[PDB]
Amino acid sequence: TSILDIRQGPKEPFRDYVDRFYKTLRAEQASQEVKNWMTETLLVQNANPDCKTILKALGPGATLEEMMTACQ
Amino acid sequence: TSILDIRQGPKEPFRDYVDRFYKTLRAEQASQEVKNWMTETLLVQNANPDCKTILKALGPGATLEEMMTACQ
Numbered sequence: 811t812s813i814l815d816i817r818q819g820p821k822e823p824f825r826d827y828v829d830r831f832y833k834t835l836r837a838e839q840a841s842q843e844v845k846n847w848m849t850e851t852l853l854v855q856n857a858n859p860d861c862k863t864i865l866k867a868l869g870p871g872a873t874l875e876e877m878m879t880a881c882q
Numbered sequence: 883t884s885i886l887d888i889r890q891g892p893k894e895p896f897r898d899y900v901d902r903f904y905k906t907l908r909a910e911q912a913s914q915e916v917k918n919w920m921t922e923t924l925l926v927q928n929a930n931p932d933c934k935t936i937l938k939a940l941g942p943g944a945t946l947e948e949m950m951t952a953c954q
Binding site for chain 1: 883884885886912913915916919920922923924926927938942943
């Protein structure tokens with residue numbers, strides 16, 4: 811599980827950070843259930859400072875499209 | 883998913899941090915598959931500075947008993 815190494819760059823667009831996150835989940839064959847938990851947690855945590863505050867502000871349970879919107 | 887709020891205290895024993903982590907996973911009815919992923923990731927990440935370095939040093943894939951031993 812090398813997901814802990816997927817961090818959003820200092821000036822990396824959230825969109826790209828997302829492709830790199832789920833692209834790693836596939837390789838490690840994460841079930842759909844796991845992806846849901848990772849989205850609520852790790853995706854949020856491994857994001858850059860500004861985004862992580864925004865995402866953390868959104869509340870637990872926002873959809874992926876809402877997260878991308880809040881950090882475009 | 884309020885797991886993101888389970889952080890190891892500055893002087894909290896790893897053992898107690900672990901009970902608080904899995905005690906939260908049950909409540910949210912995490913399957914056994916999810917718990918495995920959370921152990922490899924979130925458990926490690928939400929640990930105090932010294933422990934997180936030790937755990938990060940252990941390599942991905944150490945068992946829970948090995949983690950507790952490395953941070954006793």
